[PDB]
A and B are shown apart, each in its own frame.
Chain A
Amino acid sequence: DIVLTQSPASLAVSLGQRATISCRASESVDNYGISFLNWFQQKPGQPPKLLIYAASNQGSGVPARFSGSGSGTYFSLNIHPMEEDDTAVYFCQQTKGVSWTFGGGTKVEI
């Protein structure tokens, strides 16, 4: 069981700026060169939608503004530039071979 602590708990930045969402895992999620950590996004009244997989590559219908980076036990989620349509809850789920648990969730406002 690998726990994930997302920081901060709540984020509120103006439009056009850069939003940084951190996700510090307890153990390493890299064993075969690829990172086993995904990022999701859900809105009130909508199922979650995958944004970036392996913390490096972007999804199918995800814009280029959701840039992900990081490796090892520290990852980041960069949303720049963001608009009034990116105000949702962003999770951080790891897919290590021991347990797949979610993060805490950061409610980005404004």
Chain B
Amino acid sequence: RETWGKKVDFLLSVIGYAVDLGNVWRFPYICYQNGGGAFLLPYTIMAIFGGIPLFYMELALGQYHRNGCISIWRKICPIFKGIGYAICIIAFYIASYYNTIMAWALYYLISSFTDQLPWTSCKNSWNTGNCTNYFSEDNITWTLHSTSPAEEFYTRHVLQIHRSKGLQDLGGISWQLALCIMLIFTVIYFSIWKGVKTSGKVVWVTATFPYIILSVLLVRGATLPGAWRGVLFYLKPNWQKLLETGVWIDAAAQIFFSLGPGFGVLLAFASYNKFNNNCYQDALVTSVVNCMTSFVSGFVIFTVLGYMAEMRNEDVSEVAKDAGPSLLFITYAEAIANMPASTFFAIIFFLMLITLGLDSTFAGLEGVITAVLDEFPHVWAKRRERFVLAVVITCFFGSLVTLTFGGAYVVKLLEEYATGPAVLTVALIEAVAVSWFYGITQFCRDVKEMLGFSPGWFWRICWVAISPLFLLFIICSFLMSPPQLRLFQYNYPYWSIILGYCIGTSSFICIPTYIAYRLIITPGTFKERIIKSITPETP
């Protein structure tokens, strides 16, 4: 086993894992659609109820047993060993669209290396059609079919989505995005080449630039005409909509996929920690840091929105209707092209996006690699770099389908379905296992003998009452509500829902298959097999 080394390494790695690309455009948007200033209370409630205890439990499991995601079950619950393969499949499905969004951001950064930004005027080969929507104009030329040159640069030059008719017509592959994905994957391979020490060394700088970048973005957007409108519209308490459950479900899913428990990353990260560490303080600090980073990201996004609304003389909640990764590459691109320092600020913002994506990518890939290597110790002598290269090649082959012209449809499909009930039921199975199958008393005794004190009664009752019920509530809310996805001028067909359900079930289906395999492979009667499937084996 290898040691993290310095204390800052593990903290920076967990911070870069928690602070992802999702919390910069999705969190402020769903906070706007859900109350606004009144969205903070349910956010922190759902956090302290089901994201902080899960984070603490996962960190304690990773630090105590010192294993990945396939060998911990060998020590707590052998019947739930398929969670490792489920985590691998989920992480591959996530890494596909994550790396393709990283490639989009890298291509934007490369195209933002000129004096004049290419998404500024409507004189290019990609800015072809409707271009009445502009900035710094007294004439009000409003059209129901109009658009902006930035959306044309995004959808016709970067994505080239006009060369496809939807999910049913996927043809051609953009070579520029392919080269961007290749360069990004080489960077990833060189970042987790040797092991966790080089990963921490790259995170030391990759997880630090976004913070000063957000500081610069805040001090720029604060000194903009009309940002106060966006500020007061983001911090507008609307308790009338808080009566429904949709705001609660959105806040719960947001804090879950932001903190990221049950993804198989915290276990491997804490596997290298020392036995005399303090995982509670680390978990609390990283959770508060991720929450504050989400807050500042929403703040700068809404200041940009308010400045653009003031300079456009248009009400809020209409300039950024479309969600997804396009929100940034359209709205923030227009705002930067409107700013005097366009090239520098665009380069800075795209470097921030690249670093935020790379942090989570490194975290997930290292977690998967550690989970696989902890299960098969015989492939750790002279197969580490080979397995890392194989994982990178598999991720590249999985993202190749999203790197097409109409690939953005598959990207949204993966971002909306892979981040669905699969991770939720994985975390639920883990929680109920540690609670009943492994025993909450034994877990508390392990936490006491590891740190030096047992956790308070709050976490003890929470892990057994709230977090499993909270995850089950999210599951039953996501199951009976099929998402109605819609990209730019395209409604998803009915078979898209079936494909999303299939790709979300194929990752979860590993657990019951492994349960059946374990129940058949061991001799004895039924109850004897059940008993043998819960009690851990001898070391």
The B94-129 residues at the A interface (CB cut-off 8 A) are 124-126
Q: Which residues, 27 to 41 on A, are CB-close (under 8 Å) to B? A: 31-33, 36
Distance in angstroms between the alpha carbons of A33 and B171 in the assembled complex = 11
Question: When chains A and B are docked, how far (Å) is the Cα of A32 from the Cα of B162?
Answer: 8
Contact assessment for B125 and A33 in the assembled complex, using a CB-CB cutoff below 8 Å: no
Q: Could you tell me if A36 and B125 are in contact, using CB atoms closer than 8 angstroms?
A: yes
Q: Does A44 contact B (CB under 8 A)?
A: no
Q: What's the Cα separation between A54 and B163 when bound, in Å?
A: 15
Nearest Cβ distance between residue A72 and chain B, in whole angstroms? Answer: 14
Task: Classify the secondary structure of A's interface with B.
Answer: loop
What's the nearest-Cβ distance from chain B to residue A53, in Å? 12
What 0/1 readout, one digit per residue, does chain B (148-173) give for beta carbons within 8 Å of chain A?
00000000110010110000000000
Contacts of A33 in B (CB 8 A): 160, 162-163, 405
Interface size on A, residues (CB 8 A): 5
- Give the shortest distance, in Å, between B72 (CB) and chain A (any CB): 50
Q: Cβ of B126: which chain A residues have Cβ within 8 Å of it?
A: 32
* Any B CB within 8 A of the CB of A97: yes
Distance between Cα atoms of A36 and B163 in the complex (Å): 15
Residues of B within 8 A of A32 (CB): 125-126, 156-157, 160, 162-163
**Residues of A contacting B160 with CB < 8 Å?**
32-33
Bound: A33/B125 CA distance, A: 11
- The answer for the CA separation of A31 and B162 in the assembled complex, in Å, is 12
User: A64 CB to closest chain B CB, in angstroms?
Assistant: 25
Cα(A31)–Cα(B125), bound, Å: 9
Does A97 lie within 8 Å of B125, measured CB to CB? yes
Within the complex, what minimum Cβ distance (angstroms) separates A52 from chain B? 17
Which residues 155-201 in B have Cβ within 8 Å of A in the complex?
A: 156-157, 160, 162-163
- Min CB distance A77 to B, Å, is 23
A-side contacts of B124, CB under 8 Å: 97
How many angstroms between the C-alpha atoms of A15 and B376 in the bound complex?
80
Chain B, Cβ-Cβ closest to A31: B125
Q: In the assembly, what is the distance between CA of A36 and CA of B169, in Å?
A: 23
Measured CB to CB, the closest approach of chain B to A96, in angstroms, equals: 8
Alpha-carbon distance between A32 and B157 when the two chains are bound, in angstroms:
7
Q: How far is the CA of A32 from the CA of B126 in the complex (A)?
A: 7
Could you give 9 example pairs across A and B, Cβ below 8 Å? Answer: A31-B125, A32-B156, A32-B160, A32-B162, A33-B160, A33-B163, A33-B405, A36-B125, A97-B124
Instruction: With A31-B125, A32-B163 given, name 13 new contacts (CB 8 A).
Output: A32-B125, A32-B126, A32-B156, A32-B157, A32-B160, A32-B162, A33-B160, A33-B162, A33-B163, A33-B405, A36-B125, A97-B124, A97-B125
